[PDB]
Symmetry: C3
Subunit: 117 residues, 3 copies
């Protein structure tokens, strides 16, 4: 899975090690091994969420197979919201998530594409 987190919290207000804890959490929530989880955190951005520039975060989650239905995504959403609200000290109105299914022909790995592996 690929997780990308944009936030307007400065880097020195994002708790140390968040990217590692998010990686471990995502492995458990999405049911994928941690060695297949990728996290990117981009702090210090200029953001508005729901029309407001108060602290916020945007998460994008992309994966093969497990983010393609409302039922799956509802379950994932609950856990990611709990993690981010408590780690970042944000209310639930200050986070949004987008989910994006991928297919194996779209992923370049070790100089080839996953569809051929």
């Amino acid at each position: 899975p690929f997780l990308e987190l944009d936030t307007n919290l400065p880097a020195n207000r994002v708790p140390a090690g968040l990217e590692k804890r998010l990686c471990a959490a995502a492995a458990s929530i999405l049911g994928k091994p941690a060695d297949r989880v990728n996290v990117t955190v981009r702090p210090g951005l200029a953001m508005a969420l729901s029309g407001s520039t108060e602290p916020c975060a945007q998460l994008s989650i992309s994966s093969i197979g497990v983010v393609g239905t409302a039922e799956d995504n509802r379950s994932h959403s609950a856990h990611f919201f709990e993690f981010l609200t408590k780690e970042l000290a944000l209310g639930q109105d200050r986070i949004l998530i987008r989910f994006f299914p991928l297919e194996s022909w779209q992923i370049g790995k070790i100089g080839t594409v996953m569809a051929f592996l």
Copy 2:
């Protein structure tokens, strides 16, 4: 709607309050309430646009319903180009926009997904 703007202008060359003015402009252009508009600005990046590293900006717009046809997007493009060229003092050859339709099963909000709300 979700608007993401990448630019190679340094942060201190992006006019103060751009994210708030872009939020208000997008509400009017896309016909959505401002309390449903989200903006992310990422300045100080290393960019080339059309093969050139001169100042530039990339905008991505994602939304349910209103960014899914050429006719709709042509109208939106005109207004976003006017806004960004004049706010950022860029020529029209230094901006590109990408439009991405979303569906409600893809959006995590308040610990669930929009399809269930």
Copy 3:
């Protein structure tokens, strides 16, 4: 084409001019003129790739026509991996690529959309 590169290398460990050399390389690899190639580099991010926070890079490539099959993407992957591993001094296990087809109705250019040009 649009290329977006996220890395946890600091800006002063990304070789000077990478965005320009990546632009030229992508024109040759994807078979598009350099004046249609766009590159964005976002350094200094907090990242984990395959569960590890060691230096890494994520590349996203979006284009009309040329990134839509496994066979095409396998060819592109080989060249982009060679470029990035050698420029950034990374092993092949520290890079992943995502490929995204676009259509002309999605691209805003000079105040309109490409479908009308």
